[PDB]
Amino acid sequence: MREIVHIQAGQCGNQIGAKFWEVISDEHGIDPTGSYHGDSDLQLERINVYYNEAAGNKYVPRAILVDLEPGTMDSVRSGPFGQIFRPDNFVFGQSGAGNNWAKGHYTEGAELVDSVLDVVRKESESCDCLQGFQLTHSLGGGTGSGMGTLLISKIREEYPDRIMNTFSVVPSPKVSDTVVEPYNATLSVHQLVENTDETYCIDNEALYDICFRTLKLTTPTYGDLNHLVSATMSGVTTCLRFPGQLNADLRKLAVNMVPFPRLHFFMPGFAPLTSRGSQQYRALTVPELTQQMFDAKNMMAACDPRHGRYLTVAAVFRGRMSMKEVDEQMLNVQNKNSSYFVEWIPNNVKTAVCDIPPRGLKMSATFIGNSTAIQELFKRISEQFTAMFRRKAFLHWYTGEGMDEMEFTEAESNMNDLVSEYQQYQ
Amino acid sequence: GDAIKVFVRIRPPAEQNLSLSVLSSTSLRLHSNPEPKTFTFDHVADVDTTQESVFATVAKSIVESCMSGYNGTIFAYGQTGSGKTFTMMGPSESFSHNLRGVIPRSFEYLFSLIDREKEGKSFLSKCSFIEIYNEQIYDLLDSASAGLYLREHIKKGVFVVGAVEQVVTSAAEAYQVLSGGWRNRRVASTSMNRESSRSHAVFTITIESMEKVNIRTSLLNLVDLAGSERQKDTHAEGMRLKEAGNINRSLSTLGQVITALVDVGNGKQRHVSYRDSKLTFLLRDSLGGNAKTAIIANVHPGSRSFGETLSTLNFAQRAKLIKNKAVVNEDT
């Protein structure tokens, strides 16, 4: 039961998703030919959650690849795990998106969306029991932002009782990557607030900082950054696919992380994070892992958690460990840093445990934080957007596709409301 | 500003400890023990009160203010089967004619006043009728419609994009739009009410006058809300239960908005989550904004409804505290 439909939209979403599938395939013993070559029955027990089986022990991701240009998906196909995907699950156009939310949401994306939806429907019909949908996309482009927003809206209209979660790569205010980035991000978030149950917010700046400080990586590749995201994503759903002492459903995780409908933007983190060389000075305790998880250097969103408070924190631990040791350690953390934990919620954290480590580790952990501090990120985007709007800069590209000033104003009002709500529950 | 007007209407039980008593037009007695609780609003009507009486006490003033250029909202709030639809619309084929509720009477009164005003001023009236079903919008004027959404405006109006706006010259023409739409609003059968409303009905009349030029524009919102429902009493299951879940949720956020406003009205800081539900967003101006709002709280006497009646009264009491800032919407 509880099978998940995977969607990648836009370039960043598609390349991240390729790595995500590579990771999970390795985890479940699936080789690039779609054949299983694992050593444990636990490896196949819940393979249904991400894969469909075909004749000849072939396994196929229930994955949809969407793009408005062909090049990215062609590169995916050429790649090592690209031939595992079922070819009819590539849905793509040829007319470019111009980093333009309007092209993705209104015009060029509107032409392609129905064909995507039909494939979605087939996957849903092939599910014993659909749990939800996982999307990968950027916030600042045209395809991920415009197209992805569109797709999510239509799927929630069709499956309003199911889980809708996104891994969304967001702008980093100190190093912008596109000129219209604030426009694309604000337009996207304006609809993600309404039509998603949880959004995992990654900025590349934080990933670079992680790579430099802890992993001792002078030269990060996008592949390595994608690996980091992929590890988070795998960790999030481990307890749907495996046994545990205390188990976590996706809905239950939402169930523990969302005090108010709108506040579902999480900072993900991971542990352990060290170099190949700074590992022999360390041993692998639950305390050590928790310390590493609550280290600002191991956050994947662009904020100092001390510039705010955690409303709720979910930790998912993998490997054999004493529940009492874990609980006691987290209580100590709460006691010593009580000012960073909102006092409305006794037992500020949720713990989940999965009796199975990821390969080559004895212990691992994934961290999900919902902090008032992340309001600062929204502030920075809102200010960036606002200045350009004051001068109506770059606007003709969007007005030419039918978009109106009032819609933009609405988006800004939504952003400001979000930050106000965080201020209220500071 | 001006505090909202709250009225409590006591429906008659079907043909007997009441647990509710009418102290005076101004006050009521609920019978909770051991210790009493007294509630006072703007006006309380007991079981005998007629439809005409309700119109005179609650609606007539708002219609007049609408003519003067103010926005106005009347909405019925209460537990399932308390009388919200009967009050707003009336019976649905019952006695029928005299039983018609506030909406048809408002049509009649408004058009008579405008006809009287005619004797260089002109009037333009458009109507829209929509339902909020499962946090979704459906157009009662066209069954074909789909993809309706809410949008904020410079007119401060939150409106439904793509809703049919029907121009109406007379009360009779308006009646046709209402009758067709009323059939449209979704109703289902629960143990509590065979006629239970599964959506929140929003009937909107836009009144624009031109004195030639000065332009006065009034939005009149006549809202028949769905009611809070306990599953055990309603025995709602399946789709009926899904509707109940949405009804309770949107009503919960209505309560959240009303409470938050009370905090803010007194020196405090609070955020009103207007956009938590489509209902609260559309009603945003009606609650603390630029509109004269009257709330009719419908209660069933009867010991069984004690808890729900308590809840409705408590909500209404808080609502009374909210102050609105209504101005004439003018143009020169």
Add this chain to the structure above:
Amino acid sequence: MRECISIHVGQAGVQIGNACWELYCLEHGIQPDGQMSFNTFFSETGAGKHVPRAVFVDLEPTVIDEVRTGTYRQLFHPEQLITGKEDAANNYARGHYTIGKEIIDLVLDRIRKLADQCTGLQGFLVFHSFGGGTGSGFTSLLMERLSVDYGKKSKLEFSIYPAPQVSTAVVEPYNSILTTHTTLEHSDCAFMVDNEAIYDICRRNLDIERPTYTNLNRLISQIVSSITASLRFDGALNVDLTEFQTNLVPYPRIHFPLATYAPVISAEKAYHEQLSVAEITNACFEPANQMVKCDPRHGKYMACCLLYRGDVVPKDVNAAIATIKTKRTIQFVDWCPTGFKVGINYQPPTVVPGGDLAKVQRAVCMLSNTTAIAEAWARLDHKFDLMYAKRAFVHWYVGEGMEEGEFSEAREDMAALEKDYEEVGV
């Protein structure tokens, strides 16, 4: 004969039940297959096998899937092991209203079938958690249905209480209070522990540095065995489940025993120690050895029952009880002078290989109702108030059929209970 029925609901309860059944098998001489008053917990087949008079429920399949592949697997008959589709998601409103009102009927029919084996159906056992989503609402529903059907029959709840300081879920406080609202007016007796106390006991008396779920569950299993053995085995001064109801329920609403099991002694500490009866009794009455966060000095014991096992003499026990009465610190209620029931079984407890405990000739299970537990209730209500003031994590519950006044009514009920406890103490 006098014969019983076992129900294990929610992940935690299922886990406990596994351990319990293992213990039972080791005691009566049953294999993993079923091969060889034993019939209180094991109905015979045509030949060879014995079938645990049991029911296993969880809406998470993964829990019972684990059972279905373990060593203890073909002991169970697959009629019993029931599974759902989507889990309870730590949400009373899914366990009671939505997914509960779907499969409860099946479980009831199974229970009826099992009863139609019992000539002397003595009663039930329910294992759950004031803290799981399954165990908070579904359990209540099941109890209600059982009351509707039988009423007169004996009903027990083994309830894992929310630990005042440590907590596990984000909406443990709501769930527990909702369970209290519904279970309180059906289940005549509830035996309760929390994990914090067990952890403490493991640290101090057993010198165990790693506190984990298996050993903890084994401790609870031992208590369960001690409670039962009066039905399962011979002995002067025997006990019935109905006798517990009569003995430990002064007023019909107040029926929340604590538990404790002594000796809790490791392999070394059994030596350098005699283990006398009086000594064991003293240990049972110790503030720290109690299985919940509740100082027994902060109140008065109303009604107490003590279930001695193995090599025991009545006169010694009487002397020990006299000594305890003499002690002025351990206060009793003015109006109940006779606040002891003595239970003695010639069967000594037998401990599971690869576990915490060592052999002890003489052991006790002590079950007590006090005015002191009210503090825990008050703490829980305070927690509930603190998070209900914001009304956070409420949008999970409202969607699956709920009302705002229900919570208020529950809080009123809790207040009334507290008042009753205070009156009792006076």
